[PDB]
Design a protein around this ligand. Sequence first.
Ligand SMILES: CCC[C@H](NC(=O)CCC(=O)O)C(=O)O
Ligand SMILES: CCC[C@H](NC(=O)CCC(=O)O)C(=O)O
Ligand SMILES: CCC[C@H](NC(=O)CCC(=O)O)C(=O)O
Lengths: 320, 322, 322
Amino acid sequence: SHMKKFTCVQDIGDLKSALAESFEIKKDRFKYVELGRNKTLLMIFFNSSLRTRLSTQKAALNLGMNVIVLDINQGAWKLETERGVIMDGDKPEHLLEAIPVMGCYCDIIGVRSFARFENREYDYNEVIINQFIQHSGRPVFSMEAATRHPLQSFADLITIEEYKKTARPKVVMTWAPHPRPLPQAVPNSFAEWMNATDYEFVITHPEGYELDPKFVGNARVEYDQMKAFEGADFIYAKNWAAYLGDNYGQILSTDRNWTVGDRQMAVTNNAYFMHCLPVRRNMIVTDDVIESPQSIVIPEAANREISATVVLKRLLENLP
Amino acid sequence: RGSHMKKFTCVQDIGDLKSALAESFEIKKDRFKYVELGRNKTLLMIFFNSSLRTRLSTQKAALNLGMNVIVLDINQGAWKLETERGVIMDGDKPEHLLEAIPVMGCYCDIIGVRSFARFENREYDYNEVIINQFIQHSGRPVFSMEAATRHPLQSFADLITIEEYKKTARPKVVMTWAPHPRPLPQAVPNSFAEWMNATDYEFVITHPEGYELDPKFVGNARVEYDQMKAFEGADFIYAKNWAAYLGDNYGQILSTDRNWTVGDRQMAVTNNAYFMHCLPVRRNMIVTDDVIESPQSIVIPEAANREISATVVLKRLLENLP
Amino acid sequence: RGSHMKKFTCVQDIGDLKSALAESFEIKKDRFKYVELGRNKTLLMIFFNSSLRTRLSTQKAALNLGMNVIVLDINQGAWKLETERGVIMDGDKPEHLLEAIPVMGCYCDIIGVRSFARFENREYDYNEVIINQFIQHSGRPVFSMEAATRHPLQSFADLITIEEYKKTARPKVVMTWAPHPRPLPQAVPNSFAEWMNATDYEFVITHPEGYELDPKFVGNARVEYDQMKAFEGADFIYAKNWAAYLGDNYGQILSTDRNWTVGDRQMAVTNNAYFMHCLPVRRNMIVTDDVIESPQSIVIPEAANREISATVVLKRLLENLP
Ligand SMILES: CCC[C@H](NC(=O)CCC(=O)O)C(=O)O
Ligand SMILES: CCC[C@H](NC(=O)CCC(=O)O)C(=O)O
Ligand SMILES: CCC[C@H](NC(=O)CCC(=O)O)C(=O)O
């Protein structure tokens, strides 16, 4: 109703009407194509992106909006994040001017800023995405911040609601091996959203990979993957670098027994396989599992356009 | 057949050249006549390689039809893609082509893909594996922005331009090889041969020994190893370099013999022939500064038609969307 | 002029400043008043160098008028261009500016170009070769997004903002140099001077010894080598760095004297002068964290005006298209 931003599941409000708007748009994609007329959306990327990048633009177009995609670093000037420093080097511009400026030429702003893993507090305080909310002078929405990825999660919800065979399915989020250290933003956001639902949500990961409590909530945590997978209805695999104190942003394991393969899927209740994507085949999941019919990885991606369209619509409706 | 365009990768896709030409000139005359046809329709242009002409003329084409445009440079703004299936993705690539293709198809209505020959495996390039995967798994109509072995958008523009300047019904069009510093794909030459072979033009291909093109593209086109003989009485000169193709020289430079550089020497022997080149062009390599700057050079009006060929193709595709 | 705009590279192109500012504030008031003027008209924005403000603001401006927009980053998505004629293109560059320019002109209606001075040859930069070749060969109206020696879109933005906040009819506007770690083009300064010199303002330029600008730009503007003196009783402080321009020091850094860094010390001596800067600004080099964050700083409302200057220029250009 009165959406001023979109960085967490709280901003979307009641999940019932949110899911209603979602399926309404899936049914009539351009129904609100006149809503965003003469409204401009500025998409800012500090990181790579295929899905968010494409689906958000399609989403804005579904609402008749103008779209400006800006890849800082590539086309603009490197930004100085720390205040008070003497800008006599690498950075030609300071985030403190850049943010307000960018806000001068748009109506809504989308920002993607991966966790830098330099300082756990700096990341978890979502300093950057917050400065955009504080000084852009425009409604801001996350395209993945340091600790959350609402647009993705919202999409994960829509798709599960879409394929679930029972009213309260067992949804198991599972960790998987990866060669590089990834943020825990996707995992945090998933947990955050599944917890807002009535699903039988379970989190499984190797020892040492506990996520932030404020995110895990009262979700059951199982250190045995095969157990957690038992009778699952949906498997949401995703890797994430450590989080606890002395290991923040670190790779503690690359154990390939966690790679979601047929073995683990067999113990499930013919569960569907999900994943936000990008996905490293034969690392996170076997070719067979991802290529199998229980894999709804694509319908999942498709819904990204919907979550984004719905969010964008709400944001527009609340514009002055 | 032209009213049933499901894709656009070769000359067969365009159907009757007569009507295809008719539309081309209709649109040259009235650029935004169909600006309402693709309203709320979205085009996704995907580049795996650099581009100026295709990049710019396709977007303009899309806009002439009122479409929405999204240009994506994989590698630059996205994640590197793994092209081989079955491999363990424990390295350089975060995403696999198998997921990327379908994903991309989710957010648009029509897809345009540019993927140059990689020259790593001839079969891989000539079976057009990549471009075909986009066709098989994208879920959308796909048009080539230059694949490994063809470049229909260009050749279509070439046909339009030749039909636009030709002084006779069946001119002598000579495609000539030229020296180049790097190994280039035989896509433009192939596609040119294919389109010209589809016309009633007197088509001749001239290149040094060792640079013969795939027979399926050469067709029954006369092949002349004496550049000066080929140029005689020509009405159009289509210069373009391409790396070797046969046997052990696939994707190799056999020579950089500057005797083939198109200079006033060869042009003189022609019937005051027009000079054409798809661009980019390395001056004083492929063609002399004098020739390319000469009034017979229609290099630009040629490039300009790239907008027309793309508009007609996109229009056909729109008309055949579900 | 102004009513017959065929380009926009310098202040003469805008014409009568009075009506120019009239349109500027008309648009600030009603941003999409002419959203139908540029329908089906396409704008091509070319970038040879980085940009945040021109890049963003120009697109917004175009969208205000309902135009189609294509942003192109040569080097990134296109092929590297050969700027010199007559060379044998057998290396780094696959395309020559001589084809590229005309080609780019084929797919749009209006062209915006950004080409920073290269500091390789003073005459080459001040003759504004590149920006002029676009004007000669694009076959389209060309507006500057910052050439080697001017940046009209910025200075027109500055004029709009100074007129927007000035407290008297003819304020004292001082443009002051400032230290920087790298050599920058004198485009912004030149351009600022040029626009100020066309106003009834009291214009003063202050910089270290050795940093005198091109006389053609300086005009009859007062040049004070004592920063503190110049700042005395100022109404506006327009800080900006620039590398040497005179003889043997073209494109060089003669000084990094931090006493010139605009701080509270200098602002103190002004008449509660506003602080301005085109941006990007290196904090604690050009200006103090405090001065820029101070309430006298109108750096952002200034930047916001970039959208207006570009919307007015684009509008005039549209109104003068065939
Ligand atoms: C609009 C100003 C553009 C430019 N500034 C830079 O190139 C600054 C880059 C740096 O600070 O290193 C200049 O001085 O002309
Ligand atoms: C939407 C997912 C984005 C990201 N994943 C990656 O960046 C994976 C990159 C890699 O595989 O190297 C993450 O975990 O947040
Ligand atoms: C439209 C032509 C595209 C490409 N050309 C190049 O890759 C030229 C590169 C160079 O000149 O270095 C080719 O030959 O297929």
